[PDB]
Amino acid sequence: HLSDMLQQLHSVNASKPSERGLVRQEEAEDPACIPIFWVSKWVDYSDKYGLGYQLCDNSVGVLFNDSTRLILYNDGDSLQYIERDGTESYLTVSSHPNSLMKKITLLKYFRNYMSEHLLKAGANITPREGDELARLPYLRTWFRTRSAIILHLSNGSVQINFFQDHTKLILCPLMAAVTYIDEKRDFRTYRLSLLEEYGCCKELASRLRYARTMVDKLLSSR
Amino acid sequence: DPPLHSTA
């Protein structure tokens, strides 16, 4: 879907949504497209350990330097491990697996740190309804630019948090939608096809051009 | 102690 995201972001930009006679992005709204998952907290420690993240359901994930991942579930006991090829495994905290015991204790540092010291993003927003027992999405790859950090998940999502103005950009290619969060922390969910029809402001257009550039980077860092 | 993290 990373390639499908290019085709959606090409059409909206080729229509030039800020250069219109009258901008009406309120008419492009669609609240029923709100994502199920997004990254609420992150911790860079890739110089030693890896990047750790927290999803909106309080689940904590961590991506190690050798491209291996270990996720802890919402009950605080269930552990899912993904290997350096995309192979998944299931085990528990109390019933201690000795081979991963180092990574469990490292995960715990990330988990404690985020619950104690960090601020939750998109907090007030009510998430979308999903299958209760379905699998969690993990982190495929990430990179940092000057202006933003780019988070690419395993469910097709791409999230882009901007550093200076605290704004965030969630891209969902499956039902073709974008969820915006401004600096004053107000959330709006848009349909991209309707964002062509009716257009948007300058800051939404300049960040939808910038997102497209990050997608091209995500295809090139492989 | 991390060098970098999300909004604190």
| CATH number, residue A130 | 3.30.1120.30
Tell me which of A38, A43, A143 to substitute to probe the interface with B (most B C-beta atoms closer than 10 Å): A43
Question: Of A26, A56, A24, which is closest to residue A41 (Cα–Cα)?
Answer: A56
Could you say which of A92, A109, A136 is where a domain stops? A136
* Interface check B3 vs A, CB under 8 A: yes
Q: What resolution in angstroms, rounded to 1 decimal? A: 2.8
Query: What's the CA gap between A67 and A213, in Å, rounded?
Result: 24
Same domain, A48 and A3: no
Q: For residues A172, A24, A208 and A1, what is the CA-based torsion angle, rounded to 10 degrees?
A: 30
Q: Taking CA atoms, what residue in A is nearest to B4?
A: A44
Same domain, A127 and A47: yes
Question: Mind telling me how many Å the CA of A155 is from chain B's nearest CA?
Answer: 22
Contacts of A161 in chain B (CB under 8 A): 6
Range of the domain at A177: 1-40+137-222
Same domain, A47 and A34: no
Same domain, A63 and A127: yes
| Diameter of chain A measured on Cα atoms | 65
Residues 89-148 of A with CB under 8 A from B: 113, 117-119, 121
User: What's the structural domain count of chain A?
Assistant: 2
Asked if B8 and A118 come within 8 Å (Cβ–Cβ), the reply is: yes
For residues A84 and A68, the answer to whether their CB atoms sit within 8 Å is yes
* Interface check B1 vs A, CB under 8 A: no
Query: What's the CA gap between A154 and A138, in Å, rounded?
Result: 5
Could you say which of A112, A136, A160 is where a domain stops? A136
Same domain, A125 and A77: yes
Element counts in chain A: helices (H) and strands (E): 4, 12
Name the residue facing B3 among A42, A44, A166 (closest C-beta).
Answer: A44
For residues A96 and A108, the answer to whether their CB atoms sit within 8 Å is no
Query: What's the CA gap between A77 and A179, in Å, rounded?
Result: 31
Same domain, A13 and A58: no
Could you say which of A66, A101, A136 is where a domain stops? A136
CA A55 → CA A74, A127, A164, distances in Å? 10, 11, 22
Same domain, A148 and A210: yes
Same domain, A107 and A144: no
* Interface check A19 vs B, CB under 8 A: no
Question: Which residues, including other chains, have CB under 8 Å from residue A119's CB and lie 6 or more apart?
Answer: A41, B6, B7, B8
Query: What's the CA gap between A31 and A115, in Å, rounded?
Result: 29
* Interface check A210 vs B, CB under 8 A: no
Question: Mind telling me how many Å the CA of B7 is from chain A's nearest CA?
Answer: 6
For residues A178 and A172, the answer to whether their CB atoms sit within 8 Å is yes
A93 SS3 class: coil
What's CA A128's distance to the chain center, in Å? 15
Asked if B8 and A42 come within 8 Å (Cβ–Cβ), the reply is: no
The CB density around residue A59, as the number of other CB atoms within 10 Å, is: 21
Query: What's the CA gap between A61 and A12, in Å, rounded?
Result: 33
Method in brief: X-ray
